[model samples]
Target: SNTQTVLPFTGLNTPSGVAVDSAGTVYVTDHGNNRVVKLAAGSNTQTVLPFTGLNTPSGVAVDSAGTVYVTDHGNNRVVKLAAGSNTQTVLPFTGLNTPSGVAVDSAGTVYVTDHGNNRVVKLAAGSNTQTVLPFTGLNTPSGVAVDSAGTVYVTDHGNNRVVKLAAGSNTQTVLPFTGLNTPSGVAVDSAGTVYVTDHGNNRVVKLAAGSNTQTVLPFTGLNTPSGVAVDSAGTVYVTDHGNNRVVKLAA
Candidate 1:
């Protein structure tokens, strides 16, 4: 079965994050280069965002409007840019404490990983207002995502686990600590399947939307995988930080 397909990005420096727009344009974070790069919708290589004062960006995400949001770790904030635009800013900077990952939902709500604060914070798009997670037991959350249903999923890096938070509740640890090793990046598909990159384990895990069982993909060749993003077709892309490449897997 052609369950997976891995590819090389060839000329990246520590690709830390990846996001795909509706048009299938793949955007990646070249962390070591301090910039975001885009691969033309169907082309293999292209440098869209350059090292433009972006500080060690670690995670990237795109909203319904195609606006790009990247977590600038060096600046401890999320940088927002218009699709294909060069201008950027530390958007909703108040609650961000070393933001390392970001994800935007259909409703335009942006969930950011507040690494320094060990929690995930939510900010309304186009505004600086925020709603911090309860974080009673979260441990160094590093990546975040919101499913189509609005439920939030956060990778608790320090805890080697991922947790799901109800869309309207303050509950924590809804999806306990299990089956992960330094989980760093996460993405939810249209049908709610969850894809996560486990940095410590050097692998990716797929979990059915509401099931606890998992289908682990430890692709024989990976190098310190750091982040992941899923496209409309359920295909998953991972950034191999150690190898300085990007790999893609079929749904």
Candidate 2:
């Protein structure tokens, strides 16, 4: 029963990340192309947003207001693309070494995985200040997602583990699961289930809320998958990097 629908939006060069907005619009980080392309809901016509100063962009996220945030990996900073104006502005925080993944919470707070620094930094909603989370167990952290409760889940790439930082606390605990091989991207669904893309294993795994067991969804025709996101309808969008395409698995 493994079935998937590949969207018609193609011809991307090394598409590395994907994020969906409330309106069902898809924003992808065309890594090799050096631009972020937006595919509106129910349409094949892709519009490449006008922006500048991008270098090997990796991960992207769209805030509630439709603003797009991109992790300019090669440039060592995160840039924001405003909703309508499409203007680009680099975040004022410093000390980022090869930033990769980005996510925005309900409070508008931005979380980024500082890959080279082996830490995740949190930027308060409207402030230029940076707060390095107290997690010390991260090894080459890559992708990140925050649950409704504000708990942070991170893909610890080097250690091959998924670590969770409970909201309002600094303690770090590895999720009670195993058999992950180079996990990369992560997202949480409405019911609080955790989904992660096991890049090395070539499959997506689901961790049910408050449980240690995992269910690896049956998927075929994936190549070097990188980023993933769960839409409101529970559909899983995956960036099939090796294939130079994106796929949507039905809920």
Candidate 3:
């Protein structure tokens, strides 16, 4: 029941994405302001990342090394900031059509939901070119997450459902629940529990690693919650988009 806002709209504008690194640093894409903001480990104040001229950044993800990745949606590219670098580099990805969601696994592979193209692409660690078609036939996938076991989860917003591509498999299966309405964000904890931000329903929901029954979370009065991330410790973070803020739920 640890639902609370990180800011009272002081430094964020239509935040759409959120991710927490191993060190507890939380990253949020301030979509309306065209910037990325972060809450440093153990710090309550939000700070703007040294990024400029971003066009409606909609997704944010942190890798194992503290490197940050963002989907500059309106710009049709994903921007990368290395672990210790201040300068941003645009990932040399071509044909990215309105890319929206991004996630990095432990192995440094970057997964992105190419929203407009209806597919997910991946950039392997230490690689320059992005390999497309990792998963296909999606309808405006909005958020992506890679579980510890290598299963990839995605919010297929156009289908109003969530799907998972199990490791080493080309087939994606709908996770046995049918109550979602415009599911826009997704995440999985270390134990395989899945969390989703049901944007249309103005609520969040979760199902255990292999359970089918859905448990809608208790955080009420949320306005179009869009993106979500669950840390290894099982804490949940969601971008309260309509509220222009982010909320946290303890493990």
Candidate 4:
């Protein structure tokens, strides 16, 4: 149950975010390198995205249609690259302060963690403008994920806890994680298994659906793992930010 594969790469500096598409392709935001790359399923090598002019890109997500979204942190904006296209379009959001984490639901709505602004925003499926979520006073949220039921989960970094918003409810609550240290990334699989990257502790934890406690996975030497994504197949992908690499673990 503890199978692991540390992905091999070059020039992968500060890899901070990861997302796996339905076809098992993995997308990553090479933050320090200011670029995005993709790792194909069953392949050991990766490919660089064609879109250019990225500056410290951090968060990444792939909608069901293969469209890619990324938070250009250094540029203080979010950009998108469509399938089979080399053109990159900048979203119409204004005044974004350190947008860090991003996740796209099957409906194409994109959620981003506006870190410096202490909030999270979602770009509606076909809307150019982004709307700030109703979460009151989020403190430096860093990672976000939306499940099949439309439940939104985010890691409140400064609060040192994870929170979730039900599909249509405005109410939220701190997850039952008592020892989180700057909890950084959050993800949920189809079965409602909640996975989080315990950033400060340099490890990963998961809360099985209906479980009251989090169980730390058997990953070791993870230096500041920041982003975690679970594909439909339950494969877990993690961006080890401090280690400048990506780790793939089979469920």
Q: For this target, which candidate reaches the highest TM-score against the unseen true structure?
A: 2
How well is each residue in 1-251 modelled by candidate 4, as lDDT tens digits? 58788876668998988988999999899988888999888887889998688898888889888999998988898888998889988887867898988988878888888899898888887797778787865888899998888888889899888888887788986678768899888888999989999998888999977787889887767999988988887789889889888987887
| Per-residue accuracy of model 2 over 130-169 as CA lDDT, tens digit each | 9987787789999998877888989999999988888889
Which candidate leads in lDDT?
A: 2
Where is model 3 poorest over a 10-residue stretch in terms of lDDT?
1-10
Question: How well does each candidate superpose onto the true structure, as a TM-score?
Answer: 0.92, 0.97, 0.94, 0.96
Global lDDT scores for all candidate models: 0.79, 0.88, 0.84, 0.86
Off by over 4 Å in 4: none
lDDT of 3 by residue, 36-115 (tens): 88887678677788876699898899988889999999999988898768899888787889998998888988888999
* Model 1 lDDT per residue over 111-133, tens place: 88888887778888677678887
Q: Mark the regions of model 1 whose C-alpha exceeds 4 Å error after superposition.
A: 1-8
Clashing residue pairs in candidate 2 are: none
**Model 4's TM-score against the true structure:** 0.96
- For model 2, what is the alpha-carbon lDDT of residue 233? 87
Question: Worst lDDT window (10 residues) for model 1?
Answer: 1-10
CA RMSD per model (angstroms): 1.9, 1.1, 1.6, 1.2
